[PDB]
Amino acid sequence: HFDAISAFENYEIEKMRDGHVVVTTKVVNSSLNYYGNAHGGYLFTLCDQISGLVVISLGLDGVTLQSSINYLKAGKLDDVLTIKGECVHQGRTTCVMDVDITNQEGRNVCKATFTMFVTGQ
Amino acid sequence: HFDAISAFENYEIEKMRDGHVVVTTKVVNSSLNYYGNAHGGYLFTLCDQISGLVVISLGLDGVTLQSSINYLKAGKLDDVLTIKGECVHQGRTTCVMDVDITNQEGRNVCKATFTMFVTGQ
């Protein structure tokens, strides 16, 4: 037995300008796994939503084909995690997005790369 | 503006036997993005939780170092997604887990691979 995992119960869009996104969010009880760290799932889901926001700030609509993430340091209750997203390559129909998460201390929680297929404009 | 994404509001553990896991879950409104498909985040988070369940069914405790996922077909409201997890390699301190999601039709929604660092026994 285990309870549901949520993401984006709180958030703030600091910035969403031309394929550059920064969002801040406080870690809450919804975010943690059985060990009381931020759930990998939860952390992915932060990075993924922000990659969708990069796509949108480019004026495009899009879908993620594939993604990779590296977990570096665990997130803890009450961290202000900040989510920094940027298009590192804009092809014709596919886009590569780099998302990084750091905290209030400036340490790095995780990194992820998104390969999107652009579906419309 | 956009609302929170949840995973595992409903679930059923069909099987959790020696590094083999199968969990079923119905897609709900919590699971969908602005286009009404299952959120990549949500889908990752299903695969990731089930990889944590594989680790546990091996008698280990563990942490994910890195993960990759490929999205194949979108999930829709009211799909019974089934999540099939298996340890494809057990090293000394690291484990490789393959997770697949298929639906009620048997089509494939997504695939993911987890590289875990085993933290204890």
Next chain:
Amino acid sequence: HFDAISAFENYEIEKMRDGHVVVTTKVVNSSLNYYGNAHGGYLFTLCDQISGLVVISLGLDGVTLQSSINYLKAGKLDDVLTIKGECVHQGRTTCVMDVDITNQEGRNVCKATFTMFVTGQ
């Protein structure tokens, strides 16, 4: 200083049918790193080429957008490696190819997944 790294000084194509490829090869010296182990780039190239072969067997042309690979066991000088690729998803615009490497002892060397951009017929 280090010596050049090479791939496919020898091979046998056992099968090349409708998205299925089997190809074997004998690890030799230009396959190796400074530890006398089969180079990571070398096993990756074995995998990348057989994914290119899985795609040709399907009357298609394409370029790789993304690949992930996990290293399981070392290749040793003089190993016969069995390289298996199947296209696991055939999309309109993209295909995903699962490639595995086992050795002569059936032990598992290597697994990769390529995300392809289909470009020709």
Next chain:
Amino acid sequence: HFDAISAFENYEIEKMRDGHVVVTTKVVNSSLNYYGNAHGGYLFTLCDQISGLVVISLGLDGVTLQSSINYLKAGKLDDVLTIKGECVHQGRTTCVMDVDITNQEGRNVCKATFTMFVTGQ
């Protein structure tokens, strides 16, 4: 039938200091695929080796557990490729290395991320 694929017939090591590596190289013929483009396995090997160099510059030994790579622009015969690796996370048990490839035109060829298992000092 196809010809053997090769990597590092030539190179210059510009820097090799404290987790930072720069290395250049001239695309030649054994670097290429059947389309006359720099082979995916070839750019991967360039990246994999420079990650191995980033790790040596840090007084460490290690083996790769996982790598992800995105292909951005083709390498063309006769390109001078600039290969940059930095260790972006130094863990107790693992390190993550970001490697990029730009060409002589500053255009971006290639990006990869290696997840390493540290084994020696």
